[PDB]
Design an enzyme around this catalytic site. Structure first.
Site, PDB file in Angstrom:
ATOM      1  N   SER A 167       0.824  -1.207   0.000  1.00 30.81           N
ATOM      2  CA  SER A 167       0.000   0.000   0.000  1.00 30.81           C
ATOM      3  C   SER A 167       0.843   1.236   0.000  1.00 30.81           C
ATOM      4  O   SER A 167       0.315   2.352   0.039  1.00 30.81           O
ATOM      5  CB  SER A 167      -0.876   0.064   1.233  1.00 30.81           C
ATOM      6  N   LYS A 221      -6.194   3.595   9.317  1.00 33.57           N
ATOM      7  CA  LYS A 221      -5.188   4.551   8.881  1.00 33.57           C
ATOM      8  C   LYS A 221      -5.618   5.972   9.209  1.00 33.57           C
ATOM      9  O   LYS A 221      -4.915   6.694   9.926  1.00 33.57           O
ATOM     10  CB  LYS A 221      -4.929   4.394   7.388  1.00 33.57           C
TER      11      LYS A 221
HETATM   12  B1  LIG Z   1      -0.186  -1.428   2.974  1.00 30.39           B
HETATM   13  O1  LIG Z   1       0.021  -2.606   2.173  1.00 30.39           O
HETATM   14  O2  LIG Z   1      -1.534  -1.506   3.461  1.00 30.39           O
HETATM   15  C1  LIG Z   1       0.814  -1.372   4.124  1.00 30.39           C
HETATM   16  C2  LIG Z   1       2.279  -1.334   3.682  1.00 30.39           C
HETATM   17  C3  LIG Z   1       3.158  -0.362   4.426  1.00 30.39           C
HETATM   18  C4  LIG Z   1       2.652   0.868   4.798  1.00 30.39           C
HETATM   19  C5  LIG Z   1       3.465   1.809   5.441  1.00 30.39           C
HETATM   20  C6  LIG Z   1       4.788   1.511   5.731  1.00 30.39           C
HETATM   21  C7  LIG Z   1       5.303   0.276   5.363  1.00 30.39           C
HETATM   22  C8  LIG Z   1       4.495  -0.651   4.701  1.00 30.39           C
HETATM   23  N1  LIG Z   1       0.803  -2.573   4.873  1.00 30.39           N
HETATM   24  C9  LIG Z   1       0.796  -2.474   6.160  1.00 30.39           C
HETATM   25  O3  LIG Z   1       0.274  -1.616   6.836  1.00 30.39           O
HETATM   26  C10 LIG Z   1       1.730  -3.408   6.793  1.00 30.39           C
HETATM   27  C11 LIG Z   1       0.937  -4.550   7.377  1.00 30.39           C
HETATM   28  C12 LIG Z   1       0.290  -5.310   6.238  1.00 30.39           C
HETATM   29  C13 LIG Z   1       1.088  -5.900   5.267  1.00 30.39           C
HETATM   30  C14 LIG Z   1       0.506  -6.610   4.219  1.00 30.39           C
HETATM   31  C15 LIG Z   1      -0.878  -6.732   4.126  1.00 30.39           C
HETATM   32  C16 LIG Z   1      -1.684  -6.141   5.089  1.00 30.39           C
HETATM   33  C17 LIG Z   1      -1.097  -5.430   6.141  1.00 30.39           C
HETATM   34  N2  LIG Z   1       2.394  -2.730   7.860  1.00 30.39           N
HETATM   35  C18 LIG Z   1       3.630  -2.987   8.252  1.00 30.39           C
HETATM   36  O4  LIG Z   1       4.426  -3.673   7.640  1.00 30.39           O
HETATM   37  C19 LIG Z   1       3.965  -2.448   9.598  1.00 30.39           C
HETATM   38  C20 LIG Z   1       5.247  -2.517  10.106  1.00 30.39           C
HETATM   39  N3  LIG Z   1       5.478  -2.028  11.320  1.00 30.39           N
HETATM   40  C21 LIG Z   1       4.492  -1.485  12.036  1.00 30.39           C
HETATM   41  C22 LIG Z   1       3.208  -1.422  11.530  1.00 30.39           C
HETATM   42  N4  LIG Z   1       2.963  -1.915  10.324  1.00 30.39           N
END
Ligand SMILES: *[B]([O])([O])[C]([C]C1=[C][C]=[C][C]=[C]1)[N]C(=O)[C]([C]C1=[C][C]=[C][C]=[C]1)[N]C(=O)C1=[C]N=[C][C]=N1
Ligand SMILES: *[B]([O])([O])[C]([C]C1=[C][C]=[C][C]=[C]1)[N]C(=O)[C]([C]C1=[C][C]=[C][C]=[C]1)[N]C(=O)C1=[C]N=[C][C]=N1
Ligand SMILES: Nc1ncnc2c1ncn2[C@@H]1O[C@H](COP(=O)(O)OP(=O)(O)OP(O)(O)=S)[C@@H](O)[C@H]1O
Ligand SMILES: Nc1ncnc2c1ncn2[C@@H]1O[C@H](COP(=O)(O)OP(=O)(O)OP(O)(O)=S)[C@@H](O)[C@H]1O
Lengths: 537, 392, 304
Positions: free
Chosen positions: A435, A478
């Site tokens: 994302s 978010k």
């Molecule tokens: B996005 O795919 O919805 C998002 C990717 C992201 C956002 C911001 C910064 C780094 C990566 N995904 C996430 O929010 C992910 C969790 C996730 C991953 C795949 C599918 C669904 C959800 N978030 C994280 O990796 C993360 C790491 N550390 C703390 C909080 N979240």
């Protein structure tokens, strides 16, 4: 003599036709076996098990809903959807006479991270409509001495726990709470996970064939509610029978209000106090924001507790008079040291960074993506413990920019002479998900181009290679995380404009959400117009 | 004549109302089925476990905190944060009389490095709060039966350990200890760590239903203490039921006191010497610095043991006048060569090398990060057995 | 099942239903049962599109149970409204009415884009629940001949990708390709979405279509949806799972499918009502695909 009462007892309760003759048969088999034997007991108790189980003895269906609603609310704040699931159920009952009852009627399953109220709901929903409640703890059960009880001839015997529930309950339409159904253990040896397959089945359960009560039983008009904090471990068939209902955790507004109403007063009375101490609302937001890293409340109440324990340990060392209030100033004195950080939105337009919103079950996190562009040979290094999916997304947005170099004022042949580095602080926690697309697409642009990127605006959205902005998941957690930080501008994919109606109407007023369908609009909206730094030269 | 005598045993104990009938209806079911026929056993032993297990008997708890305070202060040094969570608990209930006296007991989990004294708390807290105590050996349990025994229809038919515990102790509110709560597995051959989810659930504890019995037992009033050296291997649901209490680990200054107050005399009093031998405070650090790396003091006392034991030989060959104070210049004669060098600190400005700090459960540790740049192409190498995250 | 029990039987699989069935199996079987049981004696009526949405939008399983529940939610919320308000007759729930009853969507549909774009082709792909619709995008940017394959592609497809690229590297002049791209242009292939892993070589010619369009800078038609396996010489090979694919295309509104020659057989099992709505082209050599797909005059200037 004494059997005759039992013989008269059979005709009283129930009963279905076939079992009646089946019953009287074994009675007329018992009545001619002589007063205690290795055969009398194994048969007598069968009848004393056929008679005690409830047959066609039920409870009414309360046409009144304003009452049934006004008892649910006094037990759980929020949970509007589950409450509605009960209302519509009673509304059907009110609108039905002379037809099926539970022929495809809600066999609920609740899902949600632990700490939210699911196992504390069965007793509530029962009190909602006066159905005699009962729990069936199933976390870790890995045998068949359960639901499919043992055959009536083994040295000992007992029907399945389910049949044993109908015995313990009094009626035929109870509320059984199959607690923790997602811990079914398939360690070889007949995981019940196969046993329930008959029970939960909404169309064939009216002929549930036990091994003790070998006569077919109908658990049709029972009302099952099974809590489970995941779905991967539930077998694919059994999950189908249930009706998934998600419990997405709590916001900060809920966790706040739910503490002022239910949590805190519950902790005062248990702590001996009655109003010798009372906290202030804003000084609970401090407890939620800094001393709590979980969706739900089973961790929060453990903080208000230590406030109350410490709120009484003083009352013995020295008393006082009147409500000793507590404010943000006094919080660290009672609980402890700030165990977490209220990640602040940082505002000045920076070069080579971008606000990013990440989703997590515990809630949303406000990430910043940092990108460096230095003289080199195009080597693209991605650090910050990035996951495989995100790395691929990063290369996408970059491969997009190398195709439209002239548009956004990029170096004509940067691909060949610039080592490019992307960092997503912090470094310890692993990250993933795609994302983050349009976040990097800005930063990488704001790096190669020296036009700094505004950080009042926090953006999120999956980017395609053509320049399309794909939709994303989890927009509420978010934006909630967004507003808490203090940001009032959001960049969002069009295809997610639908999921805005889950945000509280209050917060939606103070958000200048923008819907974009291509990355071109974003880089015009984010990058400051004129550069400020010299290029890589 | 025994059953009616057993009835009076039933007529007085406890008891939950509906369970009474749910129990009497089985004794009546044993009126017939002549003693003899095998199922009579399954009924009889059931009534034993049904009646022996205590209902409605809470041991009168102590109430003077100042008394209990110095009962804690006499066995364990430091650990101020733990002692308060007990003192706070008494001050809460002392404040309650008549109504709501025994509502719940907070389920604590104590996490810390192996070498501190955790499993020694429960042995002590019991005497402090004057409650019964019976630790449960949960190191390596891998079968969902020790929590809830197999159904009474099987041939063994013994309740889970958690009911045995309730039987050994006589009271309804013992300070039950759970050893190494994180050694349980979630794999094939059961997963007891999932069964606990029914046990430690506070607002739903009072309806625990073992499989041996078929009656809801009450564990709302029972002081569950839990130890676990780490907490990255506890099932996420469990860790959100207990209450985390950080057992830190001891610094030298605190380690010093423990040896001085408790550890050193405890050995001497158990090695014949009534004081005919003594160690000096200044020498204590040497044993701490040059012979102990582990966090905590398990690995500290067994050097005093050598000191104590070697005293016997030197005494058993020939006594001396009074005490012989061992000083810093003496330990190498007792403990031999130092097995852990003290890490010095470099003192002049050097090129390409800087001082770095790194910490482990063992404690703090100094690190000198070394860099050297050599003329060549654009390469970066990272040696020293670095993990992945640090390279980033 | 143990092999002693298995072999002494006549296994008769059941495939899992098609959406064309569901729009009919709901109306005839599940809906009437779910309106009687609900107690609503006929104060409510659902329509094809109103059912059609519930089929695709709020359901991702080959199975009527999933579909059935939603009708329960349409029935319940169709009753909870009744106690709060009566009506004269029955209110025919239409497509635009579903979100009021069944709430916000869960799985959005997949529109079939429409102006021909550069380096793009609407490939098909099926998963046990049913066929989906996957676009394929490729980028041509001056570089060092790097091939970057993203979108969580499986190891099979990446090898198939190089296959198509090797084919074009052979027959450069036949199409409008820059002669020396192989060491001056870095092709990147992306198959959104980035999360859902993808596998399988049946999307052979679609990558050949996408890649060739990119280098030639010629736009590629998107009203056509293609699938198949591609060989080095260019012999398009047959691919399984056609009934799940073409059926996915028809709903998306696609009406021109390109299919390998050898798969002329699997047309027999498609519903004869949907065939006439589809213009199926049978191709054997990838050359017959590129010709049919590409426009004869590019729009983007060349890469150099
Ligand atoms: B996005 O795919 O919805 C998002 C990717 C992201 C956002 C911001 C910064 C780094 C990566 N995904 C996430 O929010 C992910 C969790 C996730 C991953 C795949 C599918 C669904 C959800 N978030 C994280 O990796 C993360 C790491 N550390 C703390 C909080 N979240
Ligand atoms: B093809 O092999 O029939 C096709 C591969 C393919 C190409 C392009 C885009 C998607 C898929 N197969 C599939 O559609 C595969 C199943 C498969 C894989 C390997 C060999 C045979 C069959 N399905 C998917 O990859 C898929 C399905 N649904 C969503 C996402 N991916
Ligand atoms: N409105 C509310 N919503 C949620 N929980 C509440 C609410 N009011 C009180 N609680 C308390 O919060 C806790 C909810 O957790 P429980 O449902 O009991 O445990 P759980 O949700 O089943 O999590 P698991 O799966 O059992 S680990 C209980 O202690 C409730 O008493
Ligand atoms: N503050 C203290 N002062 C004095 N002795 C202490 C102190 N804390 C612990 N001890 C000693 O530590 C020992 C008990 O350590 P244990 O609890 O057995 O180790 P443990 O690490 O808690 O258990 P593990 O992790 O399963 S090995 C006893 O000899 C105590 O006297």
């Amino acid at each position: 003599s004494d059997l005759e009462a039992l013989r008269k007892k059979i005709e009283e309760v129930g009963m279905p036709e076939a079992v009646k003759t089946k019953a009287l048969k074994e009675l007329d088999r018992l009545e001619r076996m002589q007063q205690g034997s290795p055969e009398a007991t194994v048969a007598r108790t069968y009848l004393d098990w056929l008679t005690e189980v409830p047959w066609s003895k039920a409870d009414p269906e309360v046409l009144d809903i304003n009452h049934t609603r006004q008892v649910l609310d006094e037990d759980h704040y929020g949970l509007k959807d589950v409450k509605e699931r009960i209302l519509e159920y009673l509304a059907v009952r009110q609108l039905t006479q002379g037809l099926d009852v539970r022929n495809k009627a809600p066999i609920l399953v609740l899902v949600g991270p632990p700490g939210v109220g699911k196992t504390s709901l069965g007793r509530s929903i029962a009190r909602s409509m006066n159905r005699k409640f009962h729990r069936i703890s199933l976390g870790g059960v890995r045998d068949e001495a359960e639901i499919r009880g043992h055959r009536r001839t083994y040295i000992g015997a007992m029907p399945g726990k389910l049949i044993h529930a109908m015995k313990q309950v009094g009626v035929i339409n109870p509320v059984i709470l199959l607690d923790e159904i997602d811990k079914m253990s398939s360690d070889w040896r007949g995981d019940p996970a196969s046993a329930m397959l008959e029970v939960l089945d909404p169309e064939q359960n009216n002929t549930f064939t036990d091994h003790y009560l070998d006569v077919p039983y109908d658990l049709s008009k029972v009302f099952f509610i099974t809590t489970a904090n995941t779905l991967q471990t539930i077998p694919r068939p059994l999950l189908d029978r249930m009706e998934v209902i998600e419990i997405p955790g709590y916001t900060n507004m809920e966790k706040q209000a739910i503490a002022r109403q239910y949590l805190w007063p519950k902790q005062v009375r248990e702590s001996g106090m009655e109003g010798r101490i009372e906290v202030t609302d804003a000084a609970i937001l401090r407890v939620i924001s800094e001393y709590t890293r979980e969706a739900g409340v089973r961790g929060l109440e453990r903080e208000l507790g230590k406030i109350a324990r410490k709120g009484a340990k003083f009352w013995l060392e020295g008393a006082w008079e009147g409500l000793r209030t507590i404010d943000a100033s006094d919080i660290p004195t009672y609980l402890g040291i700030p165990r977490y950080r209220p990640d602040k939105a940082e505002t000045e337009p920076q070069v080579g960074t971008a606000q990013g919103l990440a989703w997590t079950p515990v809630g949303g996190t406000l990430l910043t993506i940092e990108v460096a562009a230095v003289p080199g040979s195009g080597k693209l290094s991605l650090t910050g413990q990035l996951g495989e999916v995100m790395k691929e997304s990063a290369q996408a947005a970059l491969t997009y920019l190398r195709a439209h170099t002239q548009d956004y004022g990029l170096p004509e042949d940067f691909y060949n002479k610039v080592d490019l580095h992307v960092h997503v602080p912090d470094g310890a926690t692993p990250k993933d998900g795609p994302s983050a697309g349009i976040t990097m697409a800005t930063a990488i642009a704001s790096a190669l181009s020296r036009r700094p990127a505004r950080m009042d605006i926090a953006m999120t959205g999956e980017v395609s290679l053509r320049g399309k902005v794909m939709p994303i998941g989890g927009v509420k957690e978010k934006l909630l995380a967004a507003h808490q930080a203090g940001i009032h501008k959001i960049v969002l994919p069009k295809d997610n404009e639908a999921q805005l109606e889950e945000l509280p109407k209050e917060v939606l007023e103070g958000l200048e959400i923008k819907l974009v369908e291509d990355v071109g609009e974003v880089l015009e909206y984010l990058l400051l117009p004129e550069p400020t730094m010299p290029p890589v030269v």
